[PDB]
Structure formats: C-alpha cells, structure tokens
Amino acid sequence: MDDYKRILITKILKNEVTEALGCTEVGLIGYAVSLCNISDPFSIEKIELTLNNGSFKNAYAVGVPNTKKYGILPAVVGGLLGDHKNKLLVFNGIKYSQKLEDFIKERLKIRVINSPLYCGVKIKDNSGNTFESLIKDNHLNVVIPKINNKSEINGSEKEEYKNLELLDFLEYIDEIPEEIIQLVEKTIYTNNNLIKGDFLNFGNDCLSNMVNKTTSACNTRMIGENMPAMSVAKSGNMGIMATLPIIAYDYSNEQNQEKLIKSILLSVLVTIYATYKSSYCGCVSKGGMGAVIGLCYYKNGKNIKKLDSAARTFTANLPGIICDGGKVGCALKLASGCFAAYSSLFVDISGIVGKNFKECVENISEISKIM
Amino acid sequence: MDDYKRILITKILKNEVTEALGCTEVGLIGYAVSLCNISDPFSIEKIELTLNNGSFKNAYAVGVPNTKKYGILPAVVGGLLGDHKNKLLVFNGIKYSQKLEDFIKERLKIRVINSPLYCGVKIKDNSGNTFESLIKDNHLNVVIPKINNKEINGSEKEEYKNLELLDFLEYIDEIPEEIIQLVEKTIYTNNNLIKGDFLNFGNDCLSNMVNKTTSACNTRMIGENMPAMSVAKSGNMGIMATLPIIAYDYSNEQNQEKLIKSILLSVLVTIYATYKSSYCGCVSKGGMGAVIGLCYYKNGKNIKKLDSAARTFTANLPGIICDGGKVGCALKLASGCFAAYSSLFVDISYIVGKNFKECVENISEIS
Ligand code: SF4
Numbered sequence A: 001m002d003d004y005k006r007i008l009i010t011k012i013l014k015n016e017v018t019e020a021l022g023c024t025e026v027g028l029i030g031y032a033v034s035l036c037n038i039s040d041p042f043s044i045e046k047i048e049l050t051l052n053n054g055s056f057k058n059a060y061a062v063g064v065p066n067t068k069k070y071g072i073l074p075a076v077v078g079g080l081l082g083d084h085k086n087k088l089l090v091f092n093g094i095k096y097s098q099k100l101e102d103f104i105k106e107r108l109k110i111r112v113i114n115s116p117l118y119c120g121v122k123i124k125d126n127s128g129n130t131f132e133s134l135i136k137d138n139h140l141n142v143v144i145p146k147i148n149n150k151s152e153i154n155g156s157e158k159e160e161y162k163n164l165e166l167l168d169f170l171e172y173i174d175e176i177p178e179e180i181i182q183l184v185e186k187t188i189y190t191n192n193n194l195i196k197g198d199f200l201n202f203g204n205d206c207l208s209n210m211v212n213k214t215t216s217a218c219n220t221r222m223i224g225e226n227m228p229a230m231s232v233a234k235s236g237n238m239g240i241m242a243t244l245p246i247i248a249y250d251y252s253n254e255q256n257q258e259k260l261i262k263s264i265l266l267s268v269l270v271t272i273y274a275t276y277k278s279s280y281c282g283c284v285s286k287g288g289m290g291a292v293i294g295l296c297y298y299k300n301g302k303n304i305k306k307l308d309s310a311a312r313t314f315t316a317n318l319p320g321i322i323c324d325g326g327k328v329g330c331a332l333k334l335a336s337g338c339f340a341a342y343s344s345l346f347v348d349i350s351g352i353v354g355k356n357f358k359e360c361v362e363n364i365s366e367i368s369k370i371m
Numbered sequence B: 001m002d003d004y005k006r007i008l009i010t011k012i013l014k015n016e017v018t019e020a021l022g023c024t025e026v027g028l029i030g031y032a033v034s035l036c037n038i039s040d041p042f043s044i045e046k047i048e049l050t051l052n053n054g055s056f057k058n059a060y061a062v063g064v065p066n067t068k069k070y071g072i073l074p075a076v077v078g079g080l081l082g083d084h085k086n087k088l089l090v091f092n093g094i095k096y097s098q099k100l101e102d103f104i105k106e107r108l109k110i111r112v113i114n115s116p117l118y119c120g121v122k123i124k125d126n127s128g129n130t131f132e133s134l135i136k137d138n139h140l141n142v143v144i145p146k147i148n149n150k151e152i153n154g155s156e157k158e159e160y161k162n163l164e165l166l167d168f169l170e171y172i173d174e175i176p177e178e179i180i181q182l183v184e185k186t187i188y189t190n191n192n193l194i195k196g197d198f199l200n201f202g203n204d205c206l207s208n209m210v211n212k213t214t215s216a217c218n219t220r221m222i223g224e225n226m227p228a229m230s231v232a233k234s235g236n237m238g239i240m241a242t243l244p245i246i247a248y249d250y251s252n253e254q255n256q257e258k259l260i261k262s263i264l265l266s267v268l269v270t271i272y273a274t275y276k277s278s279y280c281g282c283v284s285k286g287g288m289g290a291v292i293g294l295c296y297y298k299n300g301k302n303i304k305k306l307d308s309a310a311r312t313f314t315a316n317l318p319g320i321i322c323d324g325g326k327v328g329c330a331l332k333l334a335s336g337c338f339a340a341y342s343s344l345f346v347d348i349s350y351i352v353g354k355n356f357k358e359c360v361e362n363i364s365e366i367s
C-alpha cells in the first residue's frame, strides 16, 4: 500500500487505457492528416502520404468509421473533416463527402517505406503554400507539428512500473480509486458493446463463448462500426484480448461485477506491464498474458502458486507472433489466444518457460526482440 | 483413375504408416546403442554418448517402454538388451535389469553438441576392444556401422510430391483391402492410446478432440508399452493426423465408412506435406492432414470448401517453437486441434496461398 506506487499505477492506467474509434491503421492516417489543418480541403493541389509497410499491409481491408468505405482513401478524406483535438477519435462526428473523395482520389499519392511506425503527410495547395505532419514510432508521438501536450508517462515513470511485481498488482486490485473503478467499468461497458453477432461460434460452452464474443468484438471494430473501443497501450486488439475473454467468462460463470472489475483491472495491469518490458503479434502474447492472469484471478483468487502455473503454461503454449493474414486472420489470432489462455488454467507445467510470472514476461519479451 | 497412381500411393502408405514403441528421442538412443552389439553388457569398461541439443532437451522427461524408468540412462540400458534388427522398435521384448542400470550409471558419460540430429555411441570394454555407432540427420540414417540401406527412393518421393489433392480424393474411392486394414489398424492402435483425462473442459465436440488427442499423446510420452501408428516416423505427427478425426467421428455420425476415408485422406495429406518440407513441425504437417480429413467428413469432396479450410488453417498456424519438457508437446497438439476445428467455420479472403497445394508450400517455406 506504498501510496507513491498507487500514484504511479493510476497515472499509467489513465495514460494507457483510452478510447479509439476504428483501427489504429486508419486512425493514425486520419489523425496525421487532421494535424495539417486544411481550412478548405478543396484547395489541395496535391497530397503525399508516407507510410511504413507495417501499417500499409493491413489498412486496405480496414473500414473507416462514419464513411461506409474501407481503406486509405476514406481515412485521408475523414482526416480532412475531423478535428486534430480529437486525436485517435478524429473520425468522430464527421459528415462524409463523396464529392471530396472524388477530388482527393486524383491528388493522393502514397509512398511506402520499410521502417518502424511512420506516418508523414505533405500537402501543397492552389495558393502555393505547404503543410506537413509526422507521427513516428508511437501512435501518439507527434513529431510535426510542435505540440506541447505535456501528462504523457516519461521514462522514469515507465521504468518504475517495469520494476513492479505481480504482488503489487494483487494489492492494487483491493485499494482501487473511484476514478479507476469508473475507468474499468467504462472499459467493461465499451468493449461489451462491440459484441454484435456470431463470428466464430461452435456451441454454448464457456470456451466457445469467449471465442465467439472476442472475435465478434474484433470483427465489429475491423469492419468500421461507429463504436469506440477501450484500447490498452494504444492497441485496440490488445485491449479486446485483455478484456473480452474475462467479460465472456464472467457471463458464463458467477456474473459477479465486483469480481469482473478486479479481474479486468488485473488483466489490464499485466498487459501494460508486458508491453513496457517488451521490444519491437504482441496482441495475443501481451494481451493474452493479461487475459490468462485475469481469468486465473477470477477462478482461483490471489493464489500465487496457481497464478505462476498459469503463466508458465500459457508461455509454453504460445500462439505465434505470425500475424501474417491481414485482419480477420487478426480475429483468428485472438481466438487462438482465447484457447491458449483458457486451456492454461487446466494444465500445470514441470525449460523453455520461466519459473514465475516475471520470468515468463521477460521470456515473451525476448522472443519479440530477436524474432 | 490412373493405375500407376494406385501403385505409388500404396507403396508409400506402407513405408510411412508404421508402428512405433516410445518417443523417437529415447528410441534413437536405444537403437544407436543396440548397433554396437555388446554381447556381454557387463563387460563395458566405459561408454560415451554424443547427442545434439535438439534431442537432449527432450529425453530427460520421456519414459522408456518396458523399463518403468524415464530418461537417457534406461534408454541406453534398454539399447544394450534390444536387437538392432528391431530398429526404432528396439525396446520391444526387453527384460529390464536393475543390476545393469547400476553398473552402466557409473560408466555412462554424455557429451552434448549444438548441431542437427546426431547420435553417436563409443564403447570401450574390459578386454581393450572398442565399438562405435552413429545415426545422424534422419532417425534411420545409420552412418556407423555401414549398412545395406535396403524401399524409399528419390524418384518415387518426387513423383508423390507432384501429385494433387484431386488424386488423394480419387484414391479414397478405390482403396485396396491391405490399405483398408492398414487404416483400420491405425484407427485401432491410436484409439488405444486414449488412457484418461489430460485436458478436458466439457462434453462438446472440440473439448473431446482436445482431451482424446492429448491423452493419447501423453500415453506415448510416459513410456507405456503400447505402439502408436506413426506417420513418416513421427508418432506425434501420426496422433495429430488421426485422433481429432477419431474423436470428431465419435462425437458426430459414428460412421466407420466415413471415418476410414477421412483418416486415410488425412494420412495422405500428412505424408505429402512432410515430403514437401525439410528441417515445431508435427502440428503444421499433421494438423494440415487433420484439417483436410475433418473437412472431408463434414463436407465431402467439395474442393471449394477443402481449399478454404487449408487457407484458414494456414492463416491460424500454431506456434513455431517446439515446446520443451515433452508436456509442452501435448499442449501443441491441443492447439493444433483448435486450429483445425476452428478452420471449418471461417473462410479467408485473399501470406496465405490460394489453394491446398499453395498453402502446403507456404508452410514448407516457413519451416
Ligand atoms: S495478428 Fe496479432 S499482432 Fe498482428 S494485428 Fe492481429 S492481433 Fe495484432
């Protein structure tokens, strides 16, 4: 109950657990375009968009909220209508214009580079003036223009979090502040609304519900429904993975909101922890690690001996950072994570895996660095 | 319905679908030791065993059939009793001796190297004579001593690689009675491996496939004196290709006529994938046979649906790492069970090939 640690955890929670309208492929392009502040989008003589291949190879199949269209073209058009102050929710409240899409289709040129996250926007208008944007590395790292949005978690606050143990997260889920309780309740509500039908259902059993509900929420997001998702560390998929299996497991079990809240928070805490300790398919390795720990708390309580067994079994049955199948193969990856996390609660491991939760998170983090 | 196709397929079915007693980790050590032909195992002054790390990190937790012990020590002791003519099945009919294990424990020295498959055995006896064995690269590639090598031919294998899924679908309609008995044997042999609950979480079709496949897998791992019908010398690959289809049939129509066709189709696809690739790999090739086999039982010879099942399974391909501790292998098969079953309910648009042959080559490229 360090109180100083409570202050650290709560700042990390408000900085990483945030809303996002649409996938961050289209959300990033829209926000980068929106930062140019083109007063009259019909004045654009030419527009160049510079994206990395890691964000290009998937944006073609992602639907843009409030447009009824899919791909990069409506993400840029949407950006020209949305407000830069909305950040990741740039597509919110936009009134789509087909006349603008027809005008922009002609002047839009896309350059693709092989590098980490990069999203540059260069615009030249009829008057001869030029405009520039640049979001690099992190989904909210705005390089151009200069925006003194001072609070973002600095390196010391991040390093202090990486040094925490599972025992601290187990103590925190008892001493929860009311803002964090409302943030967790918001997360549970936001991602619950994403469930809109059957995507991969094969029964009424607990596992098939987790798979169906997690994949339905995942699909709803990817098709471009005007519904925000509560993302964890800027990843909408990682927030879905960390929450939906626990929401669906609660529904199929006690239906205890008090327990659901603690388990969802524990899961989110573990997810951010793994993300911080990781290097450059982390959705299911980091998100699924939060899910397996969260499900283990609901099913066993604060039994460290059983929480450590769940982490070793999950790490042994690691899905595979493949990712390669665009999106929809993205939902299949979440479904696989659902299976790995649920099955890990019924097997105990006696090599390639660590001894405890902290050792396993570092082993996963090592796999993502070299491979 | 070419007559030359029936000839090559049947000759390959009898060459790849064979029995196996214990995991090929322990089976390899036993066979390599057995090739030294130590007339009196109690005459051994010293023994050195040279294994690669890819086979050492497994063998400590693997049980040796007919010994009631686990590990390298009883695999070497068992090898000193078994016949080199038994090959991979060297542990069959052995009468374990604790007195020999006590004597050998003292003189056994293990050297571990970081290289592809290697299993060398050097022995020096009380009389001053020396003996040597060496199996490297393939589980049956005996380098030392020089053997006849017998029929697995390069022209025949290449002819099978060039075949299409259409040939395997035609073959499951004109099956020879020896192949029908071989498939029936496979279904029976691997069904007997199911010995309890390993990973059960319900009564549903999927949880049955997972539980039965992992229980069968575990039985083999613990060294029970029960052979398993391996596919291309892999017991795990043989389990993966058959158990989900045996457990799906049990939970569905319980049709032995369709079970045989589906099991054969699965085995055919497994050998095909194995031939197409070099150098985890049981669930990618064995699970590909399982997904095609399950798709035939559920949809028949619908090529449009068989191609969709292959693309979905290739998209949802399990982990690349070979799970250690041997316990991790049961978990890998369980994951393959999930990937194969779930692939029959999702269709993929547009990595990921267009048809079954393209997907097998994509998997082969990853390995
Ligand atoms: S495959 Fe995994 S890492 Fe890649 S986008 Fe989908 S969930 Fe994220």
Ligand code: SF4
Pocket (backbone or CB within 6 Å): B236, B280, B281, B282, B283, B321, B322, B323, B324, B328, B329, B330, B332, B333
């Ligand atoms: S982890 Fe995969 S490749 Fe390795 S032994 Fe197990 S099934 Fe075979």
